[PDB]
Structure formats: C-alpha cells, structure tokens
Amino acid sequence: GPLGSLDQKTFSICKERMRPVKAALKQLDRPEKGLSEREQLEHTRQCLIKIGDHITECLKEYTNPEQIKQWRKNLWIFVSKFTEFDARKLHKLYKHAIKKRQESQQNS
C-alpha cells in the first residue's frame, strides 16, 4: 500500500535525469563556505532554479497524467534526500525564485 523510499527502477531513473544538474544538487547537500555573502545569495538560486527547471523539463517529457504527476513528486523526493530542504520546502522555495525572477521562457 503506502510504501516509502523509491523503487529500484525509479531510483535509477532519477540518477539518469540528475546528470547535468549534479553540481547544483550536490551543492544543496554541501554548500560552499569560502565566498562572499552576496555570492552565496546568487549561488543558491542559480543551483535551485537549474535543478528545479531540469526537474520541470524532465517531467514535461512524459504525457500521461499518472507519469507527469508521479515524476513531479519522484524527482523532488530524490533531490530532497541530497539536502536539508524537504520537498515541501524545495518546491515552495523554487516557486519563490522563478516567480520573483519572472524567468521561465520556453524550450531552454
């Protein structure tokens, strides 16, 4: 019924999607400590949006409502393991970034 964790397949799938964004997601587990305050401020957003936008584009790949909805949580869960930020925070924080910045574009 309710399970927990991620399936063995589903685990491999998120690994394969989180290829280019490895730097950003790993910086969310273990941030940098040798930069400025203003530096950190841009840094965390540039990480966050690149992850969350690659998540977004990974999920527009699928067509079925089942898939786009399930992967819309699966990828957030996977990334959330690599940070202090729960998927309840991360989605909200990502939203704040994209919304504020008014970036979104198409076909990036």
Side-chain angles (χ1 to χ4, degrees), residues 18-67:
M18 279 65 230
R19 279 185 293 150
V21 289
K22 266 187 166 178
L25 99 84
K26 190 168 179 302
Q27 297 266 52
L28 255 68
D29 197 293
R30 294 213 173 185
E32 191 168 7
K33 294 301 222 73
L35 255 46
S36 331
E37 277 176 301
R38 212 83 188 187
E39 287 295 336
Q40 282 285 293
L41 214 302
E42 64 188 76
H43 194 119
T44 310
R45 282 86 185 277
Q46 281 277 294
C47 285
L48 173 67
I49 64 68
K50 204 61 140 69
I51 303 155
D53 198 22
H54 202 75
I55 290 176
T56 303
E57 85 109 290
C58 280
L59 291 6
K60 88 218 262 76
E61 202 182 7
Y62 317 103
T63 55
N64 270 83
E66 302 283 62
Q67 253 159 298

mmCIF file of all heavy atoms in Angstrom, residues 18-67:
data_model
loop_
_atom_site.group_PDB
_atom_site.id
_atom_site.type_symbol
_atom_site.label_atom_id
_atom_site.label_comp_id
_atom_site.label_asym_id
_atom_site.label_seq_id
_atom_site.Cartn_x
_atom_site.Cartn_y
_atom_site.Cartn_z
ATOM 1 N N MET A 18 19.198 13.321 -13.187
ATOM 2 C CA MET A 18 20.144 14.145 -12.457
ATOM 3 C C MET A 18 21.559 13.793 -12.917
ATOM 4 O O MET A 18 22.352 13.245 -12.145
ATOM 5 C CB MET A 18 19.942 13.975 -10.939
ATOM 6 C CG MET A 18 18.789 14.821 -10.384
ATOM 7 S SD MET A 18 17.124 14.405 -10.965
ATOM 8 C CE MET A 18 16.601 16.071 -11.433
ATOM 9 N N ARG A 19 21.885 14.147 -14.166
ATOM 10 C CA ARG A 19 23.225 14.053 -14.729
ATOM 11 C C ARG A 19 23.787 15.467 -14.816
ATOM 12 O O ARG A 19 24.614 15.805 -13.967
ATOM 13 C CB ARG A 19 23.227 13.262 -16.056
ATOM 14 C CG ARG A 19 23.216 11.739 -15.831
ATOM 15 C CD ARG A 19 23.351 10.943 -17.138
ATOM 16 N NE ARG A 19 22.176 11.111 -18.005
ATOM 17 C CZ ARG A 19 22.132 11.076 -19.342
ATOM 18 N NH1 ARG A 19 23.234 10.870 -20.059
ATOM 19 N NH2 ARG A 19 20.973 11.281 -19.950
ATOM 20 N N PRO A 20 23.295 16.357 -15.697
ATOM 21 C CA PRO A 20 23.878 17.685 -15.850
ATOM 22 C C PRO A 20 23.813 18.495 -14.549
ATOM 23 O O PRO A 20 24.792 19.123 -14.141
ATOM 24 C CB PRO A 20 23.100 18.320 -17.002
ATOM 25 C CG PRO A 20 21.752 17.614 -17.011
ATOM 26 C CD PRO A 20 22.162 16.203 -16.608
ATOM 27 N N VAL A 21 22.696 18.404 -13.826
ATOM 28 C CA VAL A 21 22.446 19.177 -12.611
ATOM 29 C C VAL A 21 23.155 18.606 -11.371
ATOM 30 O O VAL A 21 22.892 19.071 -10.259
ATOM 31 C CB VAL A 21 20.925 19.388 -12.409
ATOM 32 C CG1 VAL A 21 20.389 20.375 -13.450
ATOM 33 C CG2 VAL A 21 20.080 18.107 -12.477
ATOM 34 N N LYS A 22 24.057 17.621 -11.519
ATOM 35 C CA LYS A 22 24.774 17.045 -10.378
ATOM 36 C C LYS A 22 25.452 18.095 -9.520
ATOM 37 O O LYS A 22 25.298 18.030 -8.302
ATOM 38 C CB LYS A 22 25.799 15.978 -10.804
ATOM 39 C CG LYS A 22 25.165 14.589 -10.730
ATOM 40 C CD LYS A 22 26.177 13.467 -10.984
ATOM 41 C CE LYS A 22 25.525 12.159 -10.534
ATOM 42 N NZ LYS A 22 26.367 10.973 -10.773
ATOM 43 N N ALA A 23 26.161 19.047 -10.133
ATOM 44 C CA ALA A 23 26.823 20.093 -9.370
ATOM 45 C C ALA A 23 25.843 20.808 -8.455
ATOM 46 O O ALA A 23 26.089 20.895 -7.258
ATOM 47 C CB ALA A 23 27.477 21.112 -10.293
ATOM 48 N N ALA A 24 24.739 21.293 -9.022
ATOM 49 C CA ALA A 24 23.788 22.121 -8.306
ATOM 50 C C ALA A 24 23.185 21.333 -7.148
ATOM 51 O O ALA A 24 23.165 21.805 -6.016
ATOM 52 C CB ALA A 24 22.705 22.600 -9.272
ATOM 53 N N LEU A 25 22.694 20.122 -7.424
ATOM 54 C CA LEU A 25 22.063 19.291 -6.412
ATOM 55 C C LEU A 25 23.055 18.929 -5.307
ATOM 56 O O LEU A 25 22.691 18.927 -4.139
ATOM 57 C CB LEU A 25 21.338 18.107 -7.084
ATOM 58 C CG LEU A 25 22.063 16.747 -7.108
ATOM 59 C CD1 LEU A 25 21.850 15.956 -5.815
ATOM 60 C CD2 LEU A 25 21.521 15.896 -8.257
ATOM 61 N N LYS A 26 24.314 18.641 -5.650
ATOM 62 C CA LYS A 26 25.321 18.317 -4.644
ATOM 63 C C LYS A 26 25.667 19.547 -3.803
ATOM 64 O O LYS A 26 25.833 19.406 -2.594
ATOM 65 C CB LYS A 26 26.550 17.688 -5.304
ATOM 66 C CG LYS A 26 27.503 17.123 -4.242
ATOM 67 C CD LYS A 26 28.584 16.238 -4.876
ATOM 68 C CE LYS A 26 29.560 15.680 -3.838
ATOM 69 N NZ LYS A 26 30.247 16.736 -3.062
ATOM 70 N N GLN A 27 25.719 20.738 -4.405
ATOM 71 C CA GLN A 27 25.871 21.992 -3.656
ATOM 72 C C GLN A 27 24.724 22.199 -2.654
ATOM 73 O O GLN A 27 24.921 22.900 -1.662
ATOM 74 C CB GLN A 27 25.956 23.210 -4.598
ATOM 75 C CG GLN A 27 27.164 23.217 -5.553
ATOM 76 C CD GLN A 27 28.373 23.995 -5.041
ATOM 77 O OE1 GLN A 27 28.849 23.782 -3.927
ATOM 78 N NE2 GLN A 27 28.942 24.878 -5.846
ATOM 79 N N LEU A 28 23.539 21.620 -2.882
ATOM 80 C CA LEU A 28 22.406 21.730 -1.966
ATOM 81 C C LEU A 28 22.536 20.806 -0.751
ATOM 82 O O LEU A 28 21.905 21.089 0.272
ATOM 83 C CB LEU A 28 21.079 21.501 -2.716
ATOM 84 C CG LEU A 28 20.309 22.812 -2.957
ATOM 85 C CD1 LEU A 28 21.030 23.726 -3.957
ATOM 86 C CD2 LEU A 28 18.907 22.495 -3.487
ATOM 87 N N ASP A 29 23.356 19.756 -0.839
ATOM 88 C CA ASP A 29 23.710 18.876 0.277
ATOM 89 C C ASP A 29 24.802 19.536 1.120
ATOM 90 O O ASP A 29 24.746 19.564 2.355
ATOM 91 C CB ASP A 29 24.219 17.517 -0.249
ATOM 92 C CG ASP A 29 24.193 16.466 0.859
ATOM 93 O OD1 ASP A 29 24.974 16.606 1.824
ATOM 94 O OD2 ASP A 29 23.425 15.480 0.796
ATOM 95 N N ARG A 30 25.815 20.071 0.433
ATOM 96 C CA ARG A 30 27.059 20.580 0.995
ATOM 97 C C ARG A 30 27.387 21.920 0.343
ATOM 98 O O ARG A 30 28.061 21.908 -0.695
ATOM 99 C CB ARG A 30 28.190 19.553 0.833
ATOM 100 C CG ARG A 30 27.932 18.296 1.674
ATOM 101 C CD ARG A 30 29.231 17.681 2.193
ATOM 102 N NE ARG A 30 28.937 16.591 3.122
ATOM 103 C CZ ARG A 30 29.798 15.884 3.850
ATOM 104 N NH1 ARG A 30 31.113 16.004 3.675
ATOM 105 N NH2 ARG A 30 29.311 15.045 4.751
ATOM 106 N N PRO A 31 26.863 23.048 0.846
ATOM 107 C CA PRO A 31 27.143 24.351 0.266
ATOM 108 C C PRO A 31 28.621 24.724 0.402
ATOM 109 O O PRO A 31 29.388 24.134 1.166
ATOM 110 C CB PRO A 31 26.239 25.340 1.006
ATOM 111 C CG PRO A 31 26.043 24.674 2.364
ATOM 112 C CD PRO A 31 25.982 23.191 1.996
ATOM 113 N N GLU A 32 29.014 25.737 -0.363
ATOM 114 C CA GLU A 32 30.333 26.343 -0.340
ATOM 115 C C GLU A 32 30.434 27.286 0.870
ATOM 116 O O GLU A 32 29.417 27.781 1.375
ATOM 117 C CB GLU A 32 30.515 27.057 -1.689
ATOM 118 C CG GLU A 32 31.960 27.517 -1.903
ATOM 119 C CD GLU A 32 32.268 27.966 -3.332
ATOM 120 O OE1 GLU A 32 31.352 28.059 -4.176
ATOM 121 O OE2 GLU A 32 33.463 28.218 -3.612
ATOM 122 N N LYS A 33 31.660 27.550 1.342
ATOM 123 C CA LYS A 33 31.954 28.272 2.577
ATOM 124 C C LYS A 33 33.031 29.349 2.445
ATOM 125 O O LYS A 33 33.310 30.050 3.423
ATOM 126 C CB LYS A 33 32.352 27.279 3.688
ATOM 127 C CG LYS A 33 31.231 26.341 4.144
ATOM 128 C CD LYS A 33 30.026 27.128 4.671
ATOM 129 C CE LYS A 33 29.421 26.526 5.936
ATOM 130 N NZ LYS A 33 30.269 26.734 7.124
ATOM 131 N N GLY A 34 33.641 29.475 1.276
ATOM 132 C CA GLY A 34 34.800 30.323 1.023
ATOM 133 C C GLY A 34 34.494 31.559 0.177
ATOM 134 O O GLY A 34 35.418 32.197 -0.322
ATOM 135 N N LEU A 35 33.221 31.901 -0.029
ATOM 136 C CA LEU A 35 32.796 33.039 -0.827
ATOM 137 C C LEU A 35 32.209 34.111 0.081
ATOM 138 O O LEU A 35 32.177 34.006 1.307
ATOM 139 C CB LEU A 35 31.800 32.560 -1.903
ATOM 140 C CG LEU A 35 32.371 32.476 -3.330
ATOM 141 C CD1 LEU A 35 33.743 31.795 -3.428
ATOM 142 C CD2 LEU A 35 31.387 31.677 -4.196
ATOM 143 N N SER A 36 31.719 35.147 -0.570
ATOM 144 C CA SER A 36 31.127 36.339 -0.010
ATOM 145 C C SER A 36 29.666 36.061 0.385
ATOM 146 O O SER A 36 29.143 34.974 0.120
ATOM 147 C CB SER A 36 31.283 37.506 -1.005
ATOM 148 O OG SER A 36 32.437 37.370 -1.836
ATOM 149 N N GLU A 37 28.974 37.016 1.011
ATOM 150 C CA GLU A 37 27.553 36.889 1.323
ATOM 151 C C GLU A 37 26.712 37.047 0.056
ATOM 152 O O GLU A 37 25.799 36.258 -0.190
ATOM 153 C CB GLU A 37 27.158 37.960 2.344
ATOM 154 C CG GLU A 37 27.479 37.541 3.783
ATOM 155 C CD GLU A 37 27.154 38.671 4.755
ATOM 156 O OE1 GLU A 37 27.738 39.763 4.590
ATOM 157 O OE2 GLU A 37 26.297 38.512 5.660
ATOM 158 N N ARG A 38 27.021 38.060 -0.762
ATOM 159 C CA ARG A 38 26.250 38.358 -1.970
ATOM 160 C C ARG A 38 26.429 37.236 -2.986
ATOM 161 O O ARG A 38 25.518 36.936 -3.760
ATOM 162 C CB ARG A 38 26.743 39.680 -2.576
ATOM 163 C CG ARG A 38 25.639 40.485 -3.279
ATOM 164 C CD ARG A 38 24.857 41.317 -2.256
ATOM 165 N NE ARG A 38 23.673 41.956 -2.852
ATOM 166 C CZ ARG A 38 22.876 42.842 -2.242
ATOM 167 N NH1 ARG A 38 23.261 43.436 -1.116
ATOM 168 N NH2 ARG A 38 21.685 43.106 -2.763
ATOM 169 N N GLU A 39 27.617 36.633 -2.965
ATOM 170 C CA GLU A 39 27.988 35.483 -3.765
ATOM 171 C C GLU A 39 27.079 34.318 -3.430
ATOM 172 O O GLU A 39 26.452 33.766 -4.329
ATOM 173 C CB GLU A 39 29.439 35.099 -3.469
ATOM 174 C CG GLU A 39 30.433 36.089 -4.068
ATOM 175 C CD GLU A 39 30.415 36.109 -5.594
ATOM 176 O OE1 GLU A 39 30.001 35.102 -6.219
ATOM 177 O OE2 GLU A 39 30.805 37.170 -6.131
ATOM 178 N N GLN A 40 27.001 33.959 -2.146
ATOM 179 C CA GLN A 40 26.140 32.882 -1.671
ATOM 180 C C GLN A 40 24.701 33.114 -2.119
ATOM 181 O O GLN A 40 24.012 32.176 -2.513
ATOM 182 C CB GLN A 40 26.193 32.807 -0.138
ATOM 183 C CG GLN A 40 27.461 32.118 0.369
ATOM 184 C CD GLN A 40 27.380 30.611 0.176
ATOM 185 O OE1 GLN A 40 26.567 29.946 0.810
ATOM 186 N NE2 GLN A 40 28.221 30.035 -0.664
ATOM 187 N N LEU A 41 24.257 34.370 -2.059
ATOM 188 C CA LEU A 41 22.893 34.729 -2.376
ATOM 189 C C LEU A 41 22.567 34.355 -3.821
ATOM 190 O O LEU A 41 21.549 33.718 -4.058
ATOM 191 C CB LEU A 41 22.672 36.225 -2.069
ATOM 192 C CG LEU A 41 21.270 36.602 -1.563
ATOM 193 C CD1 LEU A 41 20.150 36.218 -2.526
ATOM 194 C CD2 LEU A 41 20.981 35.998 -0.185
ATOM 195 N N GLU A 42 23.387 34.730 -4.807
ATOM 196 C CA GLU A 42 23.131 34.304 -6.188
ATOM 197 C C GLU A 42 23.313 32.816 -6.396
ATOM 198 O O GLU A 42 22.470 32.186 -7.041
ATOM 199 C CB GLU A 42 23.936 35.123 -7.199
ATOM 200 C CG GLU A 42 25.467 35.040 -7.184
ATOM 201 C CD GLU A 42 26.036 36.081 -8.140
ATOM 202 O OE1 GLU A 42 26.040 37.279 -7.756
ATOM 203 O OE2 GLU A 42 26.276 35.744 -9.319
ATOM 204 N N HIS A 43 24.389 32.299 -5.816
ATOM 205 C CA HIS A 43 24.809 30.911 -5.890
ATOM 206 C C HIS A 43 23.640 29.968 -5.610
ATOM 207 O O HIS A 43 23.303 29.136 -6.455
ATOM 208 C CB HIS A 43 25.951 30.692 -4.897
ATOM 209 C CG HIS A 43 26.716 29.424 -5.085
ATOM 210 N ND1 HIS A 43 28.058 29.353 -5.372
ATOM 211 C CD2 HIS A 43 26.240 28.156 -4.911
ATOM 212 C CE1 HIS A 43 28.402 28.059 -5.346
ATOM 213 N NE2 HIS A 43 27.324 27.296 -5.083
ATOM 214 N N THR A 44 23.004 30.092 -4.442
ATOM 215 C CA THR A 44 21.952 29.164 -4.049
ATOM 216 C C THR A 44 20.794 29.202 -5.054
ATOM 217 O O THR A 44 20.231 28.156 -5.369
ATOM 218 C CB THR A 44 21.477 29.518 -2.632
ATOM 219 O OG1 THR A 44 22.560 29.657 -1.726
ATOM 220 C CG2 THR A 44 20.503 28.483 -2.074
ATOM 221 N N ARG A 45 20.426 30.379 -5.582
ATOM 222 C CA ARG A 45 19.342 30.457 -6.560
ATOM 223 C C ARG A 45 19.755 29.791 -7.857
ATOM 224 O O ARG A 45 18.965 29.018 -8.382
ATOM 225 C CB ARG A 45 18.868 31.889 -6.842
ATOM 226 C CG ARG A 45 17.967 32.425 -5.726
ATOM 227 C CD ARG A 45 18.819 33.029 -4.612
ATOM 228 N NE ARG A 45 18.046 33.461 -3.447
ATOM 229 C CZ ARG A 45 17.405 34.621 -3.316
ATOM 230 N NH1 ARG A 45 17.206 35.429 -4.360
ATOM 231 N NH2 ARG A 45 16.940 34.938 -2.119
ATOM 232 N N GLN A 46 20.949 30.080 -8.368
ATOM 233 C CA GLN A 46 21.445 29.511 -9.614
ATOM 234 C C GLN A 46 21.512 27.984 -9.544
ATOM 235 O O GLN A 46 21.180 27.330 -10.533
ATOM 236 C CB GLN A 46 22.809 30.130 -9.949
ATOM 237 C CG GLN A 46 22.644 31.530 -10.564
ATOM 238 C CD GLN A 46 22.354 31.468 -12.064
ATOM 239 O OE1 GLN A 46 23.195 31.037 -12.843
ATOM 240 N NE2 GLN A 46 21.196 31.899 -12.537
ATOM 241 N N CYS A 47 21.863 27.410 -8.391
ATOM 242 C CA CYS A 47 21.700 25.996 -8.122
ATOM 243 C C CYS A 47 20.218 25.599 -8.218
ATOM 244 O O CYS A 47 19.836 24.792 -9.068
ATOM 245 C CB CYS A 47 22.286 25.720 -6.731
ATOM 246 S SG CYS A 47 24.097 25.744 -6.785
ATOM 247 N N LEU A 48 19.392 26.164 -7.336
ATOM 248 C CA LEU A 48 17.984 25.852 -7.131
ATOM 249 C C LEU A 48 17.188 25.856 -8.435
ATOM 250 O O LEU A 48 16.509 24.869 -8.715
ATOM 251 C CB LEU A 48 17.428 26.862 -6.120
ATOM 252 C CG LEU A 48 15.912 26.816 -5.884
ATOM 253 C CD1 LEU A 48 15.482 25.515 -5.205
ATOM 254 C CD2 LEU A 48 15.543 28.009 -4.999
ATOM 255 N N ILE A 49 17.203 26.952 -9.203
ATOM 256 C CA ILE A 49 16.461 27.027 -10.447
ATOM 257 C C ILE A 49 16.959 25.992 -11.443
ATOM 258 O O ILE A 49 16.128 25.351 -12.064
ATOM 259 C CB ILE A 49 16.335 28.451 -11.040
ATOM 260 C CG1 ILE A 49 17.605 29.206 -11.501
ATOM 261 C CG2 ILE A 49 15.587 29.330 -10.024
ATOM 262 C CD1 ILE A 49 18.339 28.662 -12.730
ATOM 263 N N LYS A 50 18.266 25.748 -11.561
ATOM 264 C CA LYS A 50 18.765 24.828 -12.578
ATOM 265 C C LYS A 50 18.274 23.421 -12.283
ATOM 266 O O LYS A 50 17.858 22.710 -13.195
ATOM 267 C CB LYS A 50 20.298 24.907 -12.664
ATOM 268 C CG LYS A 50 20.865 24.468 -14.020
ATOM 269 C CD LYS A 50 20.343 25.351 -15.166
ATOM 270 C CE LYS A 50 21.409 25.673 -16.213
ATOM 271 N NZ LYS A 50 21.828 24.507 -17.010
ATOM 272 N N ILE A 51 18.277 23.031 -11.005
ATOM 273 C CA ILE A 51 17.719 21.755 -10.577
ATOM 274 C C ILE A 51 16.228 21.745 -10.911
ATOM 275 O O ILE A 51 15.779 20.864 -11.642
ATOM 276 C CB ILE A 51 17.956 21.492 -9.074
ATOM 277 C CG1 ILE A 51 19.445 21.539 -8.680
ATOM 278 C CG2 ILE A 51 17.393 20.113 -8.693
ATOM 279 C CD1 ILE A 51 19.612 21.885 -7.198
ATOM 280 N N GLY A 52 15.463 22.709 -10.395
ATOM 281 C CA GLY A 52 14.008 22.689 -10.451
ATOM 282 C C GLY A 52 13.470 22.830 -11.876
ATOM 283 O O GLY A 52 12.406 22.292 -12.192
ATOM 284 N N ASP A 53 14.195 23.520 -12.749
ATOM 285 C CA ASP A 53 13.863 23.697 -14.155
ATOM 286 C C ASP A 53 14.219 22.434 -14.930
ATOM 287 O O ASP A 53 13.394 21.978 -15.717
ATOM 288 C CB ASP A 53 14.581 24.925 -14.728
ATOM 289 C CG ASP A 53 13.978 25.449 -16.037
ATOM 290 O OD1 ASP A 53 12.788 25.177 -16.336
ATOM 291 O OD2 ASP A 53 14.629 26.316 -16.668
ATOM 292 N N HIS A 54 15.362 21.787 -14.641
ATOM 293 C CA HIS A 54 15.647 20.489 -15.250
ATOM 294 C C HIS A 54 14.643 19.430 -14.774
ATOM 295 O O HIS A 54 14.171 18.639 -15.582
ATOM 296 C CB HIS A 54 17.089 20.032 -14.999
ATOM 297 C CG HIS A 54 17.545 19.025 -16.028
ATOM 298 N ND1 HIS A 54 17.885 19.320 -17.329
ATOM 299 C CD2 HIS A 54 17.651 17.666 -15.872
ATOM 300 C CE1 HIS A 54 18.199 18.171 -17.943
ATOM 301 N NE2 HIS A 54 18.082 17.135 -17.094
ATOM 302 N N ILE A 55 14.245 19.444 -13.496
ATOM 303 C CA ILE A 55 13.127 18.651 -12.994
ATOM 304 C C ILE A 55 11.903 18.926 -13.870
ATOM 305 O O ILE A 55 11.300 17.975 -14.368
ATOM 306 C CB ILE A 55 12.869 18.901 -11.488
ATOM 307 C CG1 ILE A 55 13.987 18.319 -10.594
ATOM 308 C CG2 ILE A 55 11.520 18.325 -11.016
ATOM 309 C CD1 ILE A 55 13.813 18.636 -9.100
ATOM 310 N N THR A 56 11.537 20.202 -14.040
ATOM 311 C CA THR A 56 10.370 20.587 -14.818
ATOM 312 C C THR A 56 10.438 19.963 -16.214
ATOM 313 O O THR A 56 9.464 19.339 -16.646
ATOM 314 C CB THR A 56 10.239 22.121 -14.874
ATOM 315 O OG1 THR A 56 10.177 22.663 -13.565
ATOM 316 C CG2 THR A 56 8.955 22.528 -15.592
ATOM 317 N N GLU A 57 11.567 20.110 -16.907
ATOM 318 C CA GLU A 57 11.682 19.686 -18.293
ATOM 319 C C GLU A 57 11.700 18.160 -18.410
ATOM 320 O O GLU A 57 11.016 17.590 -19.258
ATOM 321 C CB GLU A 57 12.763 20.487 -19.034
ATOM 322 C CG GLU A 57 14.170 19.945 -18.877
ATOM 323 C CD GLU A 57 14.692 19.322 -20.174
ATOM 324 O OE1 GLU A 57 14.200 18.243 -20.576
ATOM 325 O OE2 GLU A 57 15.619 19.900 -20.783
ATOM 326 N N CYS A 58 12.337 17.491 -17.456
ATOM 327 C CA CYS A 58 12.266 16.049 -17.287
ATOM 328 C C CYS A 58 10.817 15.572 -17.201
ATOM 329 O O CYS A 58 10.475 14.530 -17.757
ATOM 330 C CB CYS A 58 12.992 15.647 -16.003
ATOM 331 S SG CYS A 58 14.783 15.568 -16.241
ATOM 332 N N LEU A 59 9.973 16.287 -16.459
ATOM 333 C CA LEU A 59 8.574 15.934 -16.283
ATOM 334 C C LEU A 59 7.728 16.350 -17.477
ATOM 335 O O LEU A 59 6.707 15.698 -17.654
ATOM 336 C CB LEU A 59 7.946 16.536 -15.016
ATOM 337 C CG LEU A 59 8.386 16.040 -13.625
ATOM 338 C CD1 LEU A 59 9.545 15.049 -13.606
ATOM 339 C CD2 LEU A 59 8.650 17.227 -12.695
ATOM 340 N N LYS A 60 8.042 17.391 -18.273
ATOM 341 C CA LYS A 60 7.234 17.639 -19.474
ATOM 342 C C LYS A 60 7.531 16.605 -20.562
ATOM 343 O O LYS A 60 6.817 16.579 -21.561
ATOM 344 C CB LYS A 60 7.399 19.084 -19.972
ATOM 345 C CG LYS A 60 8.576 19.298 -20.941
ATOM 346 C CD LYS A 60 9.301 20.627 -20.735
ATOM 347 C CE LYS A 60 8.887 21.757 -21.682
ATOM 348 N NZ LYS A 60 7.583 22.345 -21.327
ATOM 349 N N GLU A 61 8.568 15.776 -20.389
ATOM 350 C CA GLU A 61 8.908 14.731 -21.332
ATOM 351 C C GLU A 61 7.732 13.755 -21.431
ATOM 352 O O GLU A 61 7.317 13.397 -22.537
ATOM 353 C CB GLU A 61 10.210 14.046 -20.884
ATOM 354 C CG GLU A 61 10.884 13.338 -22.069
ATOM 355 C CD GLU A 61 12.176 12.586 -21.712
ATOM 356 O OE1 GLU A 61 12.519 12.491 -20.514
ATOM 357 O OE2 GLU A 61 12.847 12.002 -22.598
ATOM 358 N N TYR A 62 7.174 13.357 -20.284
ATOM 359 C CA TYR A 62 6.063 12.409 -20.240
ATOM 360 C C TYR A 62 4.763 13.087 -20.671
ATOM 361 O O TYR A 62 4.612 14.303 -20.518
ATOM 362 C CB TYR A 62 5.867 11.833 -18.834
ATOM 363 C CG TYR A 62 7.148 11.453 -18.141
ATOM 364 C CD1 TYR A 62 7.706 12.267 -17.135
ATOM 365 C CD2 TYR A 62 7.812 10.297 -18.576
ATOM 366 C CE1 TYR A 62 8.953 11.915 -16.584
ATOM 367 C CE2 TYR A 62 9.021 9.915 -17.989
ATOM 368 C CZ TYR A 62 9.608 10.731 -16.999
ATOM 369 O OH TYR A 62 10.839 10.409 -16.516
ATOM 370 N N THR A 63 3.781 12.285 -21.086
ATOM 371 C CA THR A 63 2.467 12.781 -21.491
ATOM 372 C C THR A 63 1.351 12.349 -20.547
ATOM 373 O O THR A 63 0.410 13.120 -20.340
ATOM 374 C CB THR A 63 2.165 12.305 -22.915
ATOM 375 O OG1 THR A 63 2.267 10.898 -23.018
ATOM 376 C CG2 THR A 63 3.116 12.940 -23.912
ATOM 377 N N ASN A 64 1.408 11.120 -20.022
ATOM 378 C CA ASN A 64 0.312 10.595 -19.216
ATOM 379 C C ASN A 64 0.221 11.386 -17.921
ATOM 380 O O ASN A 64 1.262 11.713 -17.342
ATOM 381 C CB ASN A 64 0.492 9.104 -18.899
ATOM 382 C CG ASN A 64 -0.154 8.276 -19.988
ATOM 383 O OD1 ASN A 64 0.459 8.047 -21.025
ATOM 384 N ND2 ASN A 64 -1.402 7.893 -19.811
ATOM 385 N N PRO A 65 -1.000 11.612 -17.405
ATOM 386 C CA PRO A 65 -1.204 12.362 -16.180
ATOM 387 C C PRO A 65 -0.550 11.624 -15.016
ATOM 388 O O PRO A 65 0.090 12.248 -14.182
ATOM 389 C CB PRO A 65 -2.720 12.507 -16.036
ATOM 390 C CG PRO A 65 -3.289 11.330 -16.821
ATOM 391 C CD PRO A 65 -2.274 11.164 -17.946
ATOM 392 N N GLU A 66 -0.640 10.296 -15.002
ATOM 393 C CA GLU A 66 -0.042 9.429 -13.996
ATOM 394 C C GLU A 66 1.449 9.721 -13.864
ATOM 395 O O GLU A 66 1.918 10.033 -12.770
ATOM 396 C CB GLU A 66 -0.258 7.962 -14.405
ATOM 397 C CG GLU A 66 -1.732 7.604 -14.580
ATOM 398 C CD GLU A 66 -2.471 7.393 -13.266
ATOM 399 O OE1 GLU A 66 -2.573 8.337 -12.454
ATOM 400 O OE2 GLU A 66 -3.031 6.274 -13.116
ATOM 401 N N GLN A 67 2.160 9.658 -14.994
ATOM 402 C CA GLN A 67 3.591 9.854 -15.102
ATOM 403 C C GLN A 67 3.951 11.274 -14.696
ATOM 404 O O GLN A 67 4.762 11.456 -13.794
ATOM 405 C CB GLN A 67 4.029 9.589 -16.546
ATOM 406 C CG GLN A 67 4.791 8.274 -16.711
ATOM 407 C CD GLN A 67 4.748 7.813 -18.163
ATOM 408 O OE1 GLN A 67 3.679 7.540 -18.714
ATOM 409 N NE2 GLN A 67 5.881 7.732 -18.824
#
